[PDB]
Structures are given as structure tokens and as C-alpha cells.
């Protein structure tokens, strides 16, 4: 249609046809609209402007309105310049030359078609000096009179002559002799007043190895040996004439027997002739089947009768060759001895055992050590037959067994039905079998002889005939398909083939001998060279910048070979193939002037031109040498001539991620299994702040404010309110130890969410040792005996003890507002036995005891008939006076309390005055940073799963009231228990937010941003989880929630900081690696970046704070984990092996100039994955960049130690616009980067071009110009050596590209769940989405290149593109059903597109001011509506789906070893079915198995 694939031979020769009038020739047909584009589009420099500065306009001529429509595709979808068109002569008739004038205003690509150019033109309507190009289509027309004669006659006179390009693919068809074709080009030359060069594209050899070799091979005689062939050749020459004889009129293919009749027996015929009876007798069954699917698919009575005849024919074949022999162990003294020779050459090329072979006298290759080759079959119909024979036949020869032959049958003669999807499987079964032969999974293709054209079959080892060829095309076709490293071209022929095989040998031998002698369009030597290589490394000494001593004695070749190799391993694309080509080419000095094509790919680019010499080889060898020379100078390079990038810089990335799963032993640095345990942390400020006699001591005060109250059916346990603000006294903190102003933080009691404080009342004084007992008494008292916490291992010992602060209850006196310690309590503390619980004096009716109203009210009683070891805690809840000693029991199992009593422990009332009550139960749990009287999956309806241990115990146990006489006072009102026993939960939170305090002002100290003291001016506000603001560091609220991990199942953890500090990271040590290196490269740029964000490199880089100390991980239950402060613990029992080396590969890189499972105790350690050290820095980042802007959290990453500016000084950052040096001056720019010169502009007056319609598409305006020809400037185009190409800035913008879509995802204000804003951050950046838009605004018009392979895909890909209109806008967007998916599939994306997408970002962010603004308000554009679709619904795939709905019972197998890279992933689950799906790629393939599982889910259990 519109595609094809582009010349190699033009790919560097058409700058020929740019200075001056050249023909050109391609046999294929192909790449002639693909050689068009290239001279059309690559001169728009003469067509832009008007026609009043006289600029040119370009003819194009054709003879057909097809082509006229063709070229006019052409030029639209890969060009820039204003197409038009004509094809009518009429309307041609009817214009003035001013209306011309108007028509040549308005297109620049004049289509015309032939006598319409002939009239405009001698009319005197268009100068012949208005023109620049005159291209004919099939010039070939030269030589009749055509109306190309007299235009070129016209053209004669006109004192000027555009360039001209004569294209032809029918001058060289068939065969003819030599004569011909020269005196063809001769004549056409000078008709088309232009030099012309004879065909290249019938030279097909590989010079990259050697050439195969034409020789006839031979098997002459062969005789019969079973005594068939006799009978049956007759039986078949019989039903032949016989069915010459039931012809029958034309119809559709299958209304019509004789035609498929014939061709069946005429393939058998053949068959039995040239192998034998038992292969028709094989294929007779499949031919006969075949023919009962058409027999049943159609019937009319004539065609029905002799397709019956043609079928019981062929059984009867079947049945006498079976009979006649057993089709078990076939011999070969039953074959025609041409197979047997045919077995002995094909078998030649088979693995040796003595010399190990990768999976000598043929020097090792798995490609001419292990048979790989094509064999080439006039029919299908014999190709299956033929490897049945070969495995029924080498089951008795070794040499066949290990073959393993693919044959090839697709579509044959006859088809059943249109559009049969046969045709697509078919299909991707030969792309297996292609993709396997390349790989050598493929021994031996054997293949029809009408299938060696339209599709090129690479690395055949032995390019074997076995049917003959008759036609030129033919036999170069099927030499050039052997692309391997020991090949010959097999030409086994009988006792008639020798004679045409010489023929055609000779004769297509002088044709392209004659070829070759004329390329280039100039006389000139081919292949082989001008002179075979003397050794001159004598003349041009092969050491480079090494007077090393040692080393070997070489040949010369040994230099062909390194400097090839020089460019076998360069980073860049498998679309790009260059050398620096040394262009030792005569310009007029009495020598050859040499010069060097550099690459442009490579960072020194700068032409150089060596000493001439009149022998070119020595020149040759001159600038050859003096490269070697110069690029050892920049160390460029080493040894043996080959690039140091992506060679030895690469190195192992196994030894970052997790490559061992599933095990319990010490794995990849930084696995869930690598684990060390690190010591628990502590503030100094809780720290040596035990009361000591010397102490002016100060005390806070806990605020207990209530905010929010909550709903009863809130409360699963309908509890009735009790307020925090129901307040006497206060727990103060007694020390002379400061604590800094904690931000306020919540809790949860049993009235909503309630605000803590810290403040401060009274300060200064100090207390006498007696006071100082007494209180540690009260502090040890409250810790032991109140919520009953203790376990022998500790024991209580606060002058030595870790971490000893009291507390003591602070109340109101000296009768104002500032308040003190009340003595009178801890004193009535003191007075009683009911420290203890259960006094030894009791009162029942030993001493009376009587109702006492107030008593029962704001306290806290003790049962004394239960227990009597270990007692419980109750507290008045519903005090009663309307229950009495002597009324109902609760439950109707008594009626009376007393006689429940005496029933249990004989215990019978004779004081009964005291009413009953409902009472609460005690410090049922100790968890208050999250949730406890409401579950984690959302609890809308009642009960939840949290209140299961002490608050159902409540309620079975409040089944009863309790009559005040049997439990003593305990010795503490209600107010100070509901306070105190949040003590233990509200203490802990201070030792985490304290810790902190301490992290931020460490931080700052050694960092530019805020300062070791804190004024308390920036705003800390509540935490939420389900003065000035200036830049002082964050709240220590957000540093604490990058420091959980999400194993304490808080409401907050750090997943949501991870990404937008993984995002940023890239982004800043990217635009770091990059303008930090004057020149750069790929390999470089890529083994910097890459182990720099490592989750091993990073742990490294915590040990500089020791930030694992302070982490938060295990839940917080505090029997098990948690001390009380003042207590020691005493036991009642009484690596770098993998971090040595990933260092070294960011320091490789400086070789140039760069520019349980351990067992820890629970209250003093902690052990963890090593994947948390990853996540805290990368979520502390996070928390720093969103909540202190840019300059900020540069300085923060900058004051760890790792150079994300420069490594210069704290000085020269800071005069170049506590404190203390950490830092790093600021970045610089390069003092080069391509090269800069005012005249020869032409190419930025191409990028002027570019601008002139490349303003509006990205609402831009440049204030440079060369950064923008830099965008689309790809590898291999190569007439511009002013400036780099687009890999530098594919990379310097997919980080900021990215690092903006995170950005504009975080601060989404739905601020969703970060399980799935990881579902926008790998489906948002992904080569499909990024190569799709860049086309749709037109990235591709302005793209400069010369290679084949990109142009032909992309047009192609925006064809289809272009078919879509809007994805859906018209309904279709093909995801509906797999076999939608599987059309889609059907178009392969480029890497071509996506790249200059990113590219061009970091055009917009580098060109001036490397301000991410301008990219975002360039970017937000185009991608705007892809964010709004996709966080429309978030796009769930069927891999998550799978992973997901089935938790670990449906899996996908790992990446399998296959010689194709197409891998089967079998879906690992049981009873959902196993899918054997094999996709281009793993994603695919495990996507693809996920939707026909989910396909089997959905029809079994929906």
C-alpha cells in the first residue's frame, strides 16, 4: 500500500542525489514510495517560501491516477510541506498564468500527471528554472516514444535543471543477457541527461562472513528399490489423461474438481518420482481428509463424482503402499538413492562431542556447528511428508535424530471458507517457527519453493535446493537467504539438473558480475575491495597510547576485526548500524583527501583529516590508527578496540532486588530475608532526667481537652459518655530535664478523639529527699499495681535505670489558677491497706457497715469475694439508689443478691442499706492510637472484632450488680483513672514525638534549612488519621508517619511517601548525572543512575543518622513490648557480604573522568527487613520535598552526603546568590555541547522550517534554537554534524516527565489510597501511551532520520493511528473480547516515538531556567486528558485481577529459558484450569494466561 521497506544501499548513498542529477534502481519494487519521501521531504529548504522570491516548486510526474493518489499519501503523513495535486486536464485547459501563480501559492508538492506536465510546461505557464526536483516513476518508458523525451528536450533549453531521480522496477525483470540491461542504461542515462548506475539489488552475499559459495552438488543415478514406482507412475499417468477429460467450466475454486484434481496428482506424481511411494501413501491420508471437508462443504453431482474418484484414487495408493511394505523401520535400500544422498549433504553440519559445543576444523558457532539451514521444495504437499521420512528413517541413523526439522504448511491450493481464522493461527505459528530458526531452536526448515519471496528467512546455514530454480530473482533470492557463518549454497542435482544449474550459474553470474561493476552510480569495485591488506601495522603502529610491555605478535586482520568490533557493543538502538566511515576519496590535490565519518552517537564527533597518500590503503591505515589514537586520548577507549560502554560497566542488578523468594536464609542485600536487629532509641531528654537531690524541677500538665464526642451507635458496647474534661487534678512530669513543646496529638479514650498537651504551670524549685521517696513510691505504686503490668523480668531500679521520669498527680492550690503537688493524696494513699487491695479489716458486720451515698460516686471499688489472688478493677458506671440488697437479680436465676452470695461463698447480708450498681471493668486494652471501639474494615453495621477480650467479658459479668459492702475503696477517684489509665498509650506517643524533636534538630543543624533551636513559630497542627509559617522543617506529625511502617497497622504509614520520594529522587540525581558531564553518554548514564537508587546503596546512607534506630514496626501491645519508664530488663532465661561490591559499580564508572530470624528482646532492640531502610529515606524525602518546597529538600538529601549538587563547598552555594558546612556548591552548565558556527545554517534554517508550523502544536517559543534540533535529531541520520542526538534527552526528561506525573497524582485533593496511586505511576509511563501521543500532534512530520525500519513502521503505526480518530470517539477502542486484544496485538509499537516524547520534555526543562513550570504549562496540554480518563477508573489489569481475586491458590509461573523469547507462562492454580499462552513478551503472555483464567472464573464461579 503506503509501506514498504526503505534501500540499505540509499541509506547513505542518496547523498548523491543531493548535489547532483542522479538515476536510481531497486528490483524489489519496494521502498520506492520510501524513496521518495527521503530526496523530497530532506530539500524543503528551496520550497517553503513564496513564489515571489522565485522559489522552486517541486513536479513530481507519474502515469497513473493510482500513483498520483500514492505519492499524494506519501508525502502527507511523513511531511511538513503543502501537498497538492492534479490529474485533470480540463480544468487544466481553463487557467491563466497568474491563476498558476495563485496554484504555486498555495501547495509545494505539485503531483502532475503526464500530458498535463507537458502542457503547463510549453505553454509557457512554469519555467523549466522553476524546478529542484523531476522525479519519473517507471523511467523505463525512456526508450519509446514517451513524453518524458520531449520534457527532458525542453529542459535541454532552459538555462537551468533541477535534480532529477529516475526510478524504475521492470528494466530488470526476467531474465536477459548483459548486453541488454547495459545498453538499456546507457540509453536511459542519456535520455534522462543523468549519470545512472546498473542494479543494486541483486547483490545478496554477506561479507560479514564468508560468502556461500556456488558449486553444483551431485547425485546423478539413482535406481528403484522397491518396485512401485513402475506401476504406479502408470496408474497415475492413466488417471491423469482421465481427468483430463472431466473438465468442467470456470466457477468458484471449489465448484470445479479437475483443477484440484490435478494439481493433488501431479503433487503425488512428483512426490513418488523424486522420494517414493511411502510419502504420497503418508500424505494421502491428509490430501483425502482435506478433500472430505471440501465434499461435505460443497456437492454438485459432476465435481462430486470425480473428487470421489480423486479420493478413493489416493486410498488406493495408500492401501497398496501399505500393503506392500511395513511403514515401520524404513530403509533406505527401499529409496531412491538421490534421498540418500540428499540425507549424507544435509546431515554434513551436526554437533561435535570432542570439542565442547555451545548449546576445532569448523571454529566454534552455534550456527555452523549445529544445522540451521533451508531446504528449499517445490511443493507443502511434500515438506510434513518429508520430515515424517526423517524421523521414520533417522530413528536408525543418529545423525537424523537430533534434528529437529520444522517443516512449513500454510495455505496450499483450495480454501474452505473467507476470512477463516486459520489463516491468524497459521500465522503465528510460523512467526514461532521463524523466531525459533533465528534462535536455532529450528535444525533444519523445510519449506515450500513459492514462499522464498514477500518474507526473507535469516541465519540459514545451508541454503539447499532440492528443487530446482529457472528464473534470475529466483536463484538470488535463495542464495541471499543464507545469512550464517559457514555457508554454501546446495545445488544436489540428478542426471538432467547439472546442465541447467551450470547454465543458470554462468549466465546470472555475468549478469551480476556486469551489476556490480557499476554502483554507486559511478565505475567502482563492489564488495571486495580497492586492495587486499597488506600487514601495515609495521607502517602505522597497532599499540594505542600504550608503550606497554609484553604482549602477543598479530596479523594485520587483527585490526579489521577490533575496529569493527569498536561499533559491535556502542549504547544505541538495534535500528541504528553505522561506522565511522573513513572517506578516502579523491578530491583534487594529487592524492586521495581522507577524512572520518565520526558517528554522531559518540561524544567526540569533530572531523579529522590525517596525512594523504597516493596508495589509498595507507591513507586508509592513517585515519584509521589516528582515530584509535584520539579516542584512546579520551580513554574512550582500551584494549583491543571496543567501547568500555554497557561492556564491563554493566553489572549485575540481581544484587539489588529480591532473586531469592520464599526462603528463610540471608539472601540479596536488602530482601525481607536479609534481617539485623538494631538497638531501641531514646531522647536525651528522658534520659538522666531520674529526680536527683539537686533539681529545680518543673512540671507540665496534660490538658485532657475533649474535643469530639461520638455517637452511641458509634459504640458497640453502648457505653454511656463519660467526659475528659470531668477534671480535678492533672498528671504532671516532674524533672529538671527540659522538654521541648511537643505539637498536640491525639489518643483515643471512651468519648471520641481527645487533644493531649503539654504546657507548663509553675517552675523552679526543689524538694527534700523525703518528698523524693515518698513520690517514687507513687510512681512505682501506680505502675505495678494499677493496670497490672508487671512480669518478673523487670524490676524496678530508677537511679541506674535507662530512662526514670516520675509522675504524680498535679491539682489546684494556692486556692488560683496556677496549681501544685498535693502531698494530702499520696499521703491517704499512704494511710491505707488498700494499696494492696483487699484490707485486713473487714466490714460487713465485724465492724458496720452502712450505706454511704457520695462514697460509691467518683471512685473506683475493689471486690474482696473473688480472686483472692489476683484482683480485678471495677468502677461505678450506672451508680443505683433505686436498687436495693433485697430486689430482683438481674437475671431471674435468683431474686435477691444475698441469697446469690450465700450460695457461692455462704457469705449472707446482715447490713443491707447499700443500693447496687452497674460497674466497668479495667484497662481491657492498652492499644490508643487507633481505633479500638471501631474495626479496620469499616464498621457501618455493629460489633467489632477489637472489644472481643474484656468488653465481652463486661456485660456477662455486669450480669450482676455488686452491693458496695463486699469491695473495698480503692484509694484513687474516677476522674484520675479514666486520666491515668491513658498513661501508658499517651507516655508512649511522647517517647516516639520526642524522638522526632530530636531527629529534625540534628537534621537542621547539619543542614541549611531551619536550625537546631525551634521558636515554636511554625504552625503544628492535630495529626489526622482514619507566629509564622516559616520554613523551620515540618511538624515532627509528618516525620513520625514516614517513620511507620505499614506493619503497625496505625491509620497512617509510609506507603504514600515512598512514591513522591521515589519520583523526586530519580529526577534530581538525573538532572544531576547530567549536566555534570561536559560529554556523557548512555552506559555511563545508565550505570550511574541505576545503582545510585538501590535499595542496598541506601542503607549505606542511613547509617549516617542512624535512622533504623528510631523506626516504629512492631503493633504496640505493652505486656509483651512495651516498659514502663524507671524499670532495667533482666532476663528470666537466666553484614557486608553482598554491600562490598554494588559500590564499586558506580565507582567503575570513574575509570573516566565522571565530571524472627536474629532473636532480639522485646523493650530494648528491634529487628526488621532490610527493606524497611529503603522505605523510611524514601518516604522521609517525601515528607520533606511536600511540606518545604524544592530548595529545601535538595539541601535535606544534599546534608546526608550524597553530592545531589556538585561536590564544591557550603560556601560557594551560599555567596552565590546553628549553621554549619555539609553541603555542596551549586550545579553547573556545560562550556560545550555541540558546535556553534553563524553561516551553513541551511540545517537550522531546516529547523526554521521546523518552527514555522512547530510554534503553535506546543504554544512555545524558543529563545534557543539548537535544543529544539537536538529533540528530534535521531541516531542514524547523519548530515548533521553541528549537533547530538536524541538519547542524552530521551533520558534528561523521562525523570521529569514521571517525577511531574507523581507530582500532579499526589496532590490530587481525593489524596486516594497509595495501593492503587501505584496503578498510575506504571500505567501513565509505559512506551505505548508516550509513543501514541506524540504522533496524534504531529512529533512525527518534523523527525529527521535516514534508517528503513523506522519509516516503514511508522507509517504503518500512524495509519492505524489515524484510523481511531479519539480512542472510543467512534466507539471502537478493542478490549471488549480477547479476540479484540488479539487484533490490537497485530500492530507492534515503534521505540521510536516514545523516545523523542521524553526527549522534547527535556527539551522544554533544559533550554532555559530548568523551571519543571514551563514544562508543566507546555505538557498539561497534551496530557491532560490522559490523567482524566485514567483517574476517571483507575485501569485494573487481569494480572491484579488474578493476583487479587484468588489470593495465592492462582498464580503466574517465572520467566522461562526459550530459544524464541516468546514464553508459554503457565497460570499456576489449581481448579481454575492451567492456560498455555504464548505472548510476544512476559507481560503480555501473563496477561493474556490472567484473562483466559478469569474467562474460566467468570463461567465458573462469577
Given at each position: 500500500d503506503n509501506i514498504y521497506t526503505p534501500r540499505k544501499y540509499q541509506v547513505e548513498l542518496l547523498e548523491a542525489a543531493l548535489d547532483h542529477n542522479t538515476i536510481v534502481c531497486l528490483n524489489t519494487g519496494s521502498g520506492k514510495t520510501f524513496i521518495a519521501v527521503l530526496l523530497t521531504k530532506e530539500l524543503s529548504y528551496q520550497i517553503r517560501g513564496d513564489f515571489s522570491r522565485n522559489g522552486k516548486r517541486t513536479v513530481f510526474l507519474v502515469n497513473s491516477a493510482n500513483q498520483v493518489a500514492q505519492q499524494v499519501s506519501a508525502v502527507r503523513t511523513h511531511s511538513d510541506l503543502k501537498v497538492g495535486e492534479y490529474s485533470n486536464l480540463e480544468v487544466n485547459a481553463s487557467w491563466t498564468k497568474e491563476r498558476w501563480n495563485q496554484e504555486f501559492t498555495k501547495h509545494q508538492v505539485l503531483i502532475m500527471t503526464c500530458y498535463v506536465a507537458l502542457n503547463v510546461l510549453k505553454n509557457g505557464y512554469l519555467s523549466l528554472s522553476d524546478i529542484n526536483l523531476l522525479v519519473f516513476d517507471e523511467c523505463h518508458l525512456a526508450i519509446l516514444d514517451h513524453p518524458y523525451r520531449e520534457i527532458m528536450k525542453l529542459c535541454e533549453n532552459c538555462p537551468s535543471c533541477p535534480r532529477i531521480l529516475g526510478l524504475t522496477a521492470s528494466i530488470l525483470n526476467g531474465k536477459c543477457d548483459p548486453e541488454e540491461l547495459e545498453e538499456k542504461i546507457q540509453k536511459l542515462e542519456k535520455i534522462l541527461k543523468s549519470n545512472a548506475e546498473t542494479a543494486t539489488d541483486l547483490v545478496v552475499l554477506d561479507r560479514y562472513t564468508s560468502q556461500p559459495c556456488e558449486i553444483v552438488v551431485d547425485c546423478g543415478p539413482f535406481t528403484d528399490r522397491s518396485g512401485l514406482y513402475e506401476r504406479l507412475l502408470m496408474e497415475l499417468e492413466e488417471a491423469l489423461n482421465f481427468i483430463n477429460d472431466c473438465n468442467?467450466?470456470?466457477?468458484?475454486?471449489?465448484?470445479?474438481?479437475?483443477?484440484?484434481?490435478?494439481?493433488?496428482?501431479?503433487?503425488?506424481?512428483?512426490?513418488?518420482?523424486?522420494?517414493?511411494?511411502?510419502?504420497?501413501?503418508?500424505?494421502?491420508?491428509?490430501?483425502?481428509?482435506?478433500?472430505?471437508?471440501?465434499?461435505?462443504?460443497?456437492?454438485?453431482?459432476?465435481?462430486?463424482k470425480f473428487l470421489l474418484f480423486t479420493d478413493t484414487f489416493l486410498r488406493k495408493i495408500h492401501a497398496l503402499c501399505e500393503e506392500h511394505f511395513s511403514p515401520a523401520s524404513l530403509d533406505l535400500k527401499f529409496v531412491t538413492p538421490k534421498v540418500i544422498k540428499l540425507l549424507e549433504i544435509l546431515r554434513k553440519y551436526k554437533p561435535y562431542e570432542r570439542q565442547q559445543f555451545e548449546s576445532e576444523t569448523n571454529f566454534p558457532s552455534p550456527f555452523t556447528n549445529i544445522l540451521c539451514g533451508i531446504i528449499f521444495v517445490e511443493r507443502r504437499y511434500t515438506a510434513v511428508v518429508l520430515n515424517r521420512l526423517i524421523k521414520e528413517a533417522g530413528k536408525q541413523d543418529p545423525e537424523l535424530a537430533y534434528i529437529s526439522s520444522n517443516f512449513i504448511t500454510g495455505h496450499g491450493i483450495g480454501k474452505n471458507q473467507p476470512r477463516n481464522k486459520q489463516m491468524e493461527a497459521e500465522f503465528r505459528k510460523q512467526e514461532e517457527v521463524l523466531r525459533k530458526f533465528r534462535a536455532h531452536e529450528t535444525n533444519l526448515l523445510i519449506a515450500t519453493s513459492i514462499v522464498e519471496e514477500g518474507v526473507d528467512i535469516p541465519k540459514c546455514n545451508l541454503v539447499v535446493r532440492f528443487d530446482l530454480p529457472t528464473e534470475y530473482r529466483s536463484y538470488v533470492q535463495s542464495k541471499g537467504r543464507a545469512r550464517a557463518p559457514i555457508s554454501n549454497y546446495i545445488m544436489l542435482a540428478d542426471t538432467d539438473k547439472i546442465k541447467s544449474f551450470e547454465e543458470d550459474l554462468k549466465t546470472y553470474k555475468a549478469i551480476e558480475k556486469i551489476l556490480r561493476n557499476k554502483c554507486s552510480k559511478s565505475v567502482d569495485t563492489g564488495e571486495t575491495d580497492i586492495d587486499p591488506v597488506m600487514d601495515d601495522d609495521d607502517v602505522f603502529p597497532p599499540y594505542v597510547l600504550r608503550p606497554d610491555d609484553g604482549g602477543p605478535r598479530v596479523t594485520i586482520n587483527t585490526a579489521i576485526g577490533h575496529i569493527n568490533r569498536y561499533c559491535a557493543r556502542l549504547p544505541s538502538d538495534p535500528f541504528t548500524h553505522l561506522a565511522p566511515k573513513c572517506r578516502t576519496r579523491e578530491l583534487p590535490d594529487g592524492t586521495f583527501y581522507s577524512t572520518l565519518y565520526l558517528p554522531i552517537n559518540s561524544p567526540l564527533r569533530a572531523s579529522i583529516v590525517g596525512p594523504p597518500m597516493s596508495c589509498v590503503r595507507l591513507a586508509e591505515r592513517v585515519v584509521a590508527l589516528i582515530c584509535c589514537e584520539k579516542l584512546h586520548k579520551i580513554?574512550?577507549?582500551?584494549?583491543?578496540?571496543?567501547?568500555?560502554?554497557?561492556?564491563?560497566?554493566?553489572?549485575?542488578?540481581?544484587?539489588?532486588?529480591?532473586?531469592?523468594?520464599?526462603?528463610?536464609?540471608?539472601?540479596?542485600?536488602?530482601?525481607?530475608?536479609?534481617?539485623?536487629?538494631?538497638?531501641?532509641?531514646?531522647?536525651?531528654?528522658?534520659?538522666?532526667?531520674?529526680?536527683?537531690?539537686?533539681?529545680?524541677?518543673?512540671?507540665?500538665?496534660?490538658?485532657?481537652?475533649?474535643?469530639?464526642?461520638?455517637?452511641?451507635?458509634?459504640?458497640?458496647?453502648?457505653?454511656?459518655?463519660?467526659?475528659?474534661?470531668?477534671?480535678?487534678?492533672?498528671?504532671?512530669?516532674?524533672?529538671?530535664?527540659?522538654?521541648?513543646?511537643?505539637?498536640?496529638?491525639?489518643?483515643?479514650?471512651?468519648?471520641?478523639?481527645?487533644?493531649?498537651?503539654?504546657?507548663?504551670?509553675?517552675?523552679?524549685?526543689?524538694?527534700?529527699?523525703?518528698?523524693?521517696?515518698?513520690?517514687?513510691?507513687?510512681?512505682?505504686?501506680?505502675?505495678?499495681?494499677?493496670?497490672?503490668?508487671?512480669?518478673?523480668?523487670?524490676?524496678?531500679?530508677?537511679?541506674?535505670?535507662?530512662?526514670?521520669?516520675?509522675?504524680?498527680?498535679?491539682?489546684?492550690?494556692?486556692?488560683?489558677?496556677?496549681?501544685?503537688?498535693?502531698?494530702?493524696?499520696?499521703?491517704?494513699?499512704?494511710?491505707?491497706?488498700?494499696?494492696i487491695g483487699i484490707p485486713s479489716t473487714k466490714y460487713t458486720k465485724e465492724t458496720p457497715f452502712v450505706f454511704k451515698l457520695e462514697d460509691y460516686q467518683d471512685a473506683v471499688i475493689i471486690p474482696r469475694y473473688r480472686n483472692f489472688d489476683q484482683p480485678h478493677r471495677f468502677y461505678v458506671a450506672d451508680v443505683y439508689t433505686d436498687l436495693t440488697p433485697l430486689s430482683k437479680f438481674p437475671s431471674p436465676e435468683y431474686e435477691t443478691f444475698a441469697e446469690y452470695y450465700k450460695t457461692k461463698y455462704n457469705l449472707d447480708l446482715t447490713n443491707l442499706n447499700q443500693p447496687l450498681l452497674d460497674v466497668d471493668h479495667t484497662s481491657s486494652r492498652l492499644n490508643l492510637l487507633t481505633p479500638r471501639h471501631l474495626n479496620q474494615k469499616g464498621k457501618a453495621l455493629p460489633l467489632s472484632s477489637a472489644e472481643k477480650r474484656k468488653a465481652k467479658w463486661e456485660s456477662l459479668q455486669n450480669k450482676q450488680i455488686l452491693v458496695p459492702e463486699l469491695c473495698a475503696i480503692h484509694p484513687i477517684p474516677a476522674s484520675l483513672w479514666r486520666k491515668a489509665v491513658c498513661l501508658p498509650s499517651i507516655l508512649y506517643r511522647l517517647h516516639c514525638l520526642l524522638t522526632a524533636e530530636e531527629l529534625r534538630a540534628q537534621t537542621a543543624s547539619d543542614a541549611g534549612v531551619g536550625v537546631r533551636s525551634l521558636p515554636a513559630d511554625f504552625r503544628y497542627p492535630n495529626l489526622d488519621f482514619g507566629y509564622s509559617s516559616r520554613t523551620l522543617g515540618p511538624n515532627p506529625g509528618l516525620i513520625l508517619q514516614a517513620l511507620t511502617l505499614s506493619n503497625a497497622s496505625d491509620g497512617f504509614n509510609l506507603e504514600r511517601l515512598e512514591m513522591l520520594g521515589d519520583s523526586f529522587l530519580k529526577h534530581a540525581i538525573t538532572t544531576y548525572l547530567f549536566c555534570t558531564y561536559p560529554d556523557a553518554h548512555e552506559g555511563r548514564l545508565s550505570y550511574m543512575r541505576s545503582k545510585k537508587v538501590s535499595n542496598c546503596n541506601l542503607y549505606r546512607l542511613g547509617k549516617k543518622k542512624g535512622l533504623p534506630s528510631r523506626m516504629v514496626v512492631s503493633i504496640f501491645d505493652p505486656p509483651v513490648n512495651w516498659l514502663p519508664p524507671g524499670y532495667v530488663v533482666n532476663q528470666d532465661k537466666s553484614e557486608d557480604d553482598f554491600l562490598e561490591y554494588d559500590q564499586e559499580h558506580i565507582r567503575f564508572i570513574d575509570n573516566m573522568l565522571m565530571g524472627q530470624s536474629i532473636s532480639y528482646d522485646l523493650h530494648t532492640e528491634q529487628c526488621i527487613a532490610d527493606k524497611s531502610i529503603a522505605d523510611c529515606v524514601e518516604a522521609l524525602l517525601g515528607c520533606y520535598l511536600t511540606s518545604c518546597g524544592e530548595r529545601a529538600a535538595q539541601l535535606f538529601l544534599c546534608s546526608l552526603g550524597l553530592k545531589v549538587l556538585p561536590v564544591i563547598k557550603r560556601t560557594d552555594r551560599e555567596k552565590a546568590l546553628v549553621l554549619k558546612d555539609s553541603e555542596y556548591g551549586c550545579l553547573k552548565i556545560p562550556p560545550r555541547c555541540m558546535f556553534d558556527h553563524p553561516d551553513a545554517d541551511k540545517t537550522l534554517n531546516h529547523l526554521i522550517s521546523g518552527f514555522e508550523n512547530f510554534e503553535k502544536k506546543i504554544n512555545y517559543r524558543f529563545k534557543n534554537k539548537a535544543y529544539l534540533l537536538q529533540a528530534f535529531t535521531h541516531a542514524s541520520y547523519h548530515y548533521n554534524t553541528i549537533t547530538d542526538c536524541y538519547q542524552r534527552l530521551e533520558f534528561l526528561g523521562d525523570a521529569i516527565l514521571d517525577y511531574l506525573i507523581t507530582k500532579h497524582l499526589y496532590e490530587d485533593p481525593r489524596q486516594h489510597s497509595p495501593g492503587v496511586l501505584t496503578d498510575l505511576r506504571s500505567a501513565l509511563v509505559n512506551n505505548t501511551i508516550f509513543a501514541s501521543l506524540a504522533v496524534k500532534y504531529d512529533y512525527h512530520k518534523y523527525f529527521k532520520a535516514v534508517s528503513p525500519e523506522l519509516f516503514h513502521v511508522i507509517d504503518d503505526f500512524v495509519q492505524f493511528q489515524l484510523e481511531k480518530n479519539e480512542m472510543q470517539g467512534m466507539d471502537s477502542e478493542l478490549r471488549r473480547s480477547e479476540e479484540d486484544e488479539e487484533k490490537e496485538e497485530d500492530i507492534e509499537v515503534p521505540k521510536a516515538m516514545g523516545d523523542i516524547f521524553e526527549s522534547l520534555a527535556g527539551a522544554i526543562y533544559m533550554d532555559s531556567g530548568m523551571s519543571l513550570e514551563t514544562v508543566w504549562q507546555v505538557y498539561y496540554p497534551m496530557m491532560r486528558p490522559l490523567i482524566e480518563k485514567f483517574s476517571a477508573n483507575v485501569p485494573r489489569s487481569p494480572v491484579r485481577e488474578l493476583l487479587e481475586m484468588e489470593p495465592e491458590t492462582a498464580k503466574f509461573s517465572p520467566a522461562e529459558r526459550t530459544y524464541d523469547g516468546k514464553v508459554r507462562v503457565t497460570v499456576e492454580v489449581v481448579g481454575k484450569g492451567k492456560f498455555k499462552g504464548v505472548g510476544r513478551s512476559y507481560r503480555i503472555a501473563k496477561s493474556a494466561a490472567a484473562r483466559r483464567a478469569l474467562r474460566s472464573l467468570k463461567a465458573n464461579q462469577p
Open positions: 468442467i467450466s470456470v466457477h468458484s475454486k471449489e465448484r470445479d474438481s479437475t483443477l484440484i484434481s490435478k494439481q493433488i496428482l501431479s503433487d503425488c506424481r512428483a512426490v513418488l518420482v523424486v522420494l517414493g511411494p511411502w510419502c504420497a501413501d503418508k500424505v494421502a491420508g491428509m490430501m483425502v481428509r482435506e478433500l472430505q471437508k471440501y465434499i461435505k462443504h460443497e456437492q454438485e453431482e459432476l465435481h462430486r580513554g574512550e577507549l582500551d584494549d583491543h578496540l571496543m567501547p568500555v560502554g554497557k561492556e564491563t560497566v554493566k553489572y549485575e542488578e540481581e544484587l539489588d532486588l529480591h532473586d531469592e523468594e520464599e526462603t528463610s536464609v540471608p539472601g540479596r542485600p536488602g530482601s525481607t530475608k536479609r534481617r539485623q536487629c538494631y538497638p531501641k532509641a531514646i531522647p536525651e531528654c528522658l534520659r538522666d532526667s531520674y529526680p536527683r537531690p539537686d533539681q529545680p524541677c518543673y512540671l507540665y500538665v496534660i490538658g485532657m481537652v475533649l474535643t469530639t464526642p461520638l455517637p452511641d451507635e458509634l459504640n458497640f458496647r453502648r457505653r454511656k459518655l463519660y467526659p475528659p474534661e470531668d477534671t480535678t487534678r492533672c498528671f504532671g512530669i516532674l524533672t529538671a530535664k527540659p522538654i521541648p513543646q511537643i505539637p498536640h496529638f491525639p489518643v483515643y479514650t471512651r468519648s471520641g478523639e481527645v487533644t493531649i498537651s503539654i504546657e507548663l504551670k509553675k517552675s523552679g524549685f526543689m524538694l527534700s529527699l523525703q518528698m523524693l521517696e515518698l513520690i517514687t513510691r507513687l510512681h512505682q505504686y501506680i505502675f505495678s499495681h494499677i493496670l497490672r503490668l508487671e512480669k518478673p523480668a523487670l524490676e524496678f531500679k530508677p537511679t541506674d535505670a535507662d530512662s526514670a521520669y516520675c509522675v504524680l498527680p498535679l491539682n489546684v492550690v494556692n486556692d488560683s489558677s496556677t496549681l501544685d503537688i498535693d502531698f494530702k493524696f499520696m499521703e491517704d494513699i499512704e494511710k491505707s491497706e488498700a494499696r
